């Protein structure tokens, strides 16, 4: 018949090749589709949904795991005190593991874009406070003062009727994309820290409770992308699923 020659790649099974296989049922016709709500077409639609960040990931909270979703604020005695600090890379081990952005970034290798963090205040109406939420590009470690942490991208938050503020994390990076940071040589993809400070104080009248809690939410912006699908290390099968 036709003269042909076979090349390398014959009789291999690559698990990702997009081929045409032979059918098993000639004349089949599937069940007609109906309008099921909530259809999804990219995974970037789900990465833009705010989910709860676990800033309070302590070793003392692992027996009562519901406390990891909240950080307490209180009436202070010193002025300008550090409240919490956490890194801003979604694919690293830490507070970003509880988010749907973090759990879907670990299915990919590289990422690029801006992130937003929304802090909600769950205190009383008679409470009054101001906080400073800062973001520091890579360099040294966490600062010791807020006179050092004010030199970065910072947002002055005032409590009131609008009980949420949004801190954006800008895309400040050397490269166009950014692989996932670890403790080693892959730490030239670090994104920096996010610190919360007391701007003035947390002030309550008599009768109001002197400790309130803040829940943190995190999602992605519109210029967020992902690249190079991989397999997560968050799922681990040990023996067998009966």
């Amino acid at each position, epitope marked *: 018949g036709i003269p042909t020659e076979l090349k390398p790649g014959t009789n291999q099974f690559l698990t990702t090749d997009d081929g045409v296989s032979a059918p098993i049922l000639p004349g089949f016709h599937p069940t007609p589709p109906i309008h099921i709500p909530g259809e999804v077409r990219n995974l970037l639609e789900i990465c833009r949904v705010e989910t709860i960040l676990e800033v309070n990931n302590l070793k003392t909270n692992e027996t009562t795991p519901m406390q990891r979703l909240c950080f307490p604020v209180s*009436v202070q*005695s*010193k002025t300008g005190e550090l409240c919490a600090a956490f890194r801003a890379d979604p694919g690293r081990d830490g507070p970003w593991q509880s988010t749907i952005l973090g759990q879907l970034c670990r299915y990919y290798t590289q990422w690029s874009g801006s992130l937003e963090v929304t802090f909600m205040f769950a205190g009383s109406f008679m409470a009054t406070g101001k906080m400073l939420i800062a973001y520091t590009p890579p360099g040294g470690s966490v600062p010791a003062d807020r006179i050092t942490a004010m030199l970065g991208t910072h947002v002055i938050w005032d409590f009131g009727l609008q009980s949420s503020v949004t801190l954006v994390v800008p895309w400040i990076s050397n490269t166009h994309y950014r692989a996932h940071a670890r403790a080693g040589y892959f730490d030239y993809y670090t994104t920096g820290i996010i610190t919360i400070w007391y701007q003035t104080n947390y002030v309550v009248p*008599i009768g109001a409770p*002197t400790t309130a809690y803040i829940v943190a939410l995190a999602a992605a912006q519109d210029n967020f992308t992902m690249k190079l699908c991989k397999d997560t290390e968050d799922i681990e099968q040990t023996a067998n699923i009966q």
Partner: antibody
Amino acid sequence: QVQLQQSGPELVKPGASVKISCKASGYAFSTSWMNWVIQRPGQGLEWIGRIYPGDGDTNYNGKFKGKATLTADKSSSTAYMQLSSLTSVDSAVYFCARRDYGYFDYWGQGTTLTVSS
Amino acid sequence: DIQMTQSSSYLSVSLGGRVTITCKASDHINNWLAWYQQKPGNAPRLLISGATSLETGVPSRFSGSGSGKDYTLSITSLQTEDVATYYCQQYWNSPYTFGGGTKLEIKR
């Protein structure tokens, strides 16, 4: 190690004035409050006033406003308390304490002052 | 002006026992109470801060508690270097009022 060292004892006539020093050491002096506590013999312990040596502001007790006045010299790391119009009820022991988180964590040695003619 | 009452001024128990020193306030002080110990002659030494926490250097015989407006310092068990006057201090409002002082003595 952080230590506070006050001046020695004094003894003055009724109507005079004294100046008690309190030298701090081993500490960032201009960024913490320095308090003063009076102990009359031998039952009580009461607050007088505090001072922030960085900007120089002072907060007095209500029953020691016109009698005590506080300054601070950051070039020597030394606080001062000038008690004026000294009378017979002003015979007590005057302490010098610093404030860490609202409480007094470190105290001085305790200078004593007697007023008699 | 939060008057803070410490009753009573004298109490006496022997060695190896249990002391309980009470201090009652007038307004809510938000657990911002501190305990001091003053031996006769020297300066006061801070033992408890925040009605629960021990300072670095004091032993585990001291342990404080309290909820509401009444508070408690407990020494278990009492040694011979622990005989001194004990004061409570309120640092929630100014003037930072001290207590009356409960002197400890020996029972024989």
